[PDB]
Amino acid sequence: MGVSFKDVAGMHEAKLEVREFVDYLKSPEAKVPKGALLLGPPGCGKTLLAKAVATEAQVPFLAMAGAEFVEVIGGLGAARVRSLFKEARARAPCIVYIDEIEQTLNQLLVEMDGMGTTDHVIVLASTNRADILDGALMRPGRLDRHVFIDLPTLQERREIFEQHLKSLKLTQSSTFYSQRLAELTPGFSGADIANICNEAALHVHTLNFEYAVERVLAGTAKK
Numbered sequence: 001m002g003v004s005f006k007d008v009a010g011m012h013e014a015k016l017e018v019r020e021f022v023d024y025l026k027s028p029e030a031k032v033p034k035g036a037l038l039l040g041p042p043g044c045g046k047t048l049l050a051k052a053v054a055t056e057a058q059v060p061f062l063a064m065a066g067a068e069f070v071e072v073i074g075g076l077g078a079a080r081v082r083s084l085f086k087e088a089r090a091r092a093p094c095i096v097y098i099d100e101i102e103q104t105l106n107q108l109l110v111e112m113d114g115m116g117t118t119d120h121v122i123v124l125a126s127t128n129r130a131d132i133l134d135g136a137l138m139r140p141g142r143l144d145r146h147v148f149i150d151l152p153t154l155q156e157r158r159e160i161f162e163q164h165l166k167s168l169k170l171t172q173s174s175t176f177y178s179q180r181l182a183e184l185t186p187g188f189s190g191a192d193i194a195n196i197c198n199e200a201a202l203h204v205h206t207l208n209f210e211y212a213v214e215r216v217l218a219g220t221a222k223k
């Protein structure tokens with residue numbers, strides 16, 4: 001079994017917001033959801049959440065990187081977009097995930113505009129770039145909504161530390177330490193937090209706190 005909501009720490013408002021897509025994918029049959037933009041800084045769980053939504057609905061997850069688009073080879077991106085959406089229709093219900101953002105873009109707009117009631121695909125698109133909100137993916141009949149996912153708050157950081165201390169079998173006193181690790185890590189992303197824990201795992205079922213603390217102060221300069 002894959003990434004689920006259990007593996008996604010914090011992000012409580014965003015979980016409430018992708019619920020409608022979980023519900024739709026679980027039984028197509030209100031307005032028909034097409035999908036959503038996940039917006040925010042890197043390493044903050046956009047991809048993890050999109051994977052979790054597929055797992056929760058129990059459907060396939062089909063991904064395309066925004067960097068299979070940028071027109072370097074003529075026609076190639078359009079052709080990959082078409083294959084993607086044809087596989088998605090055949091494997092439906094399912095999630096199509098476009099990670100991290102115009103023949104290739106126009107083809108995507110065509111696939112989306114061409115999505116009717118019968119298709120049962122949800123498109124989740126992620127980006128670090130806010131001005132994507134102003135463009136063609138957010139026009140009527142395309143991506144329905146966006147969800148802003150920011151750097152984790154103190155409490156969210158507590159939860160992310162706890163999740164990763166437990167994934168790495170360092171559960172003993174993980175909750176004792178999580179509070180201070182959170183206080184020490186303003187402006188850290190979930191990825192930064194995962195890297196601290198793993199670096200400390202790479203140095204029995206309890207965190208080496210004094211080392212974790214060292215890596216937090218190192219990473220505070222440059223992560």
Ligand SMILES: Nc1ncnc2c1ncn2[C@@H]1O[C@H](COP(=O)(O)OP(=O)(O)O)[C@@H](O)[C@H]1O
Pocket residue numbers: 007008009010011041042043044045046047048049126160163189190191192194
């Ligand atoms: N909310 C979170 N809960 C648990 N781990 C997280 C969270 N956010 C980030 N991470 C960790 O950071 C990794 C990279 O994040 P990713 O999903 O690539 O984020 P993004 O798509 O926003 O740039 C995740 O696979 C996970 O290990």
